[PDB]
Amino acid sequence: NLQNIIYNPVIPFVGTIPDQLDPGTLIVIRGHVPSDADRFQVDLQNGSSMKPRADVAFHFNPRFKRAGCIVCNTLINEKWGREEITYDTPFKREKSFEIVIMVLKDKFQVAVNGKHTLLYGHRIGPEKIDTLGIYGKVNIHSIGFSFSSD
Ligand SMILES: O=C(O)c1ccc2ccc(CO[C@@H]3C=CO[C@H](CO)[C@@H]3O)nc2c1
Ligand SMILES: [Cl-]
């Protein structure tokens, strides 16, 4: 049931999500962190405006300085909300990964390399997400969706 919208996209990548992010929908991202990486992000956006910047329902932002972390947050009218930081990060420089985002009724559930990593409660209705963005120092092998639609 996995339908890739792309392989080996140039970074930054910005793409339209082909169906609604209904409860039960999976987003699967396969990739690798370069050795010199400081951060990268996956942004589920309401639109693709660069100026002013599109609302980000879900900012998933692995950071690599010191013992590393993941910052998750939401951008509404170009303001960030309260950061949700996970200090347990499975991401490392020069390591491949499989990110799985599961869209539930009330939150995203993210697993990496087949292990639970974090939850994040919806602050924008996920039905308002229509765009996926990947920015920063990262190589992406694939991006795909398993929709509730099919
Ligand atoms: O790494 C890159 O090349 C790249 C590309 C596009 C970007 C867009 C935005 C930001 C700033 O991010 C925010 C700064 C501080 O806190 C926020 C989270 O609350 C959030 O992480 N950094 C970027 C970095
Ligand atoms: Cl839920």
Author numbering: 7 to 156
Paper lines:
pmcGalectins are a family of proteins that bind β-d-galactopyranoside-containing glycoconjugates through their canonical carbohydrate recognition domains (CRDs). However, there are major differences between the two CRDs, such as the presence of Arg45, Arg59, Tyr141, and Gln47 in the N-terminal CRD (galectin-8N) and the presence of Ser255, Asn257, and Asn348 in the C-terminal CRD (galectin-8C).
Galectin-8N was first cocrystallized with lactose, and then the ligands were soaked into galectin-8N-lactose crystals, followed by collection of X-ray diffraction data at 1.52 and 2.1 Å resolution for the galectin-8N–6a complex and galectin-8N–9 complex, respectively. Further, the O6 of the d-galactal engages in hydrogen bonding interactions with Asn79 and Glu89, while the O3 engages in a hydrogen bonding interaction with Arg45. As for the galectin-8N–9 complex, the quinoline ring is placed in a favorable position to establish an interaction with Arg45 while the carboxylate moiety establishes a water-mediated hydrogen bond with Gln47 and Arg45.
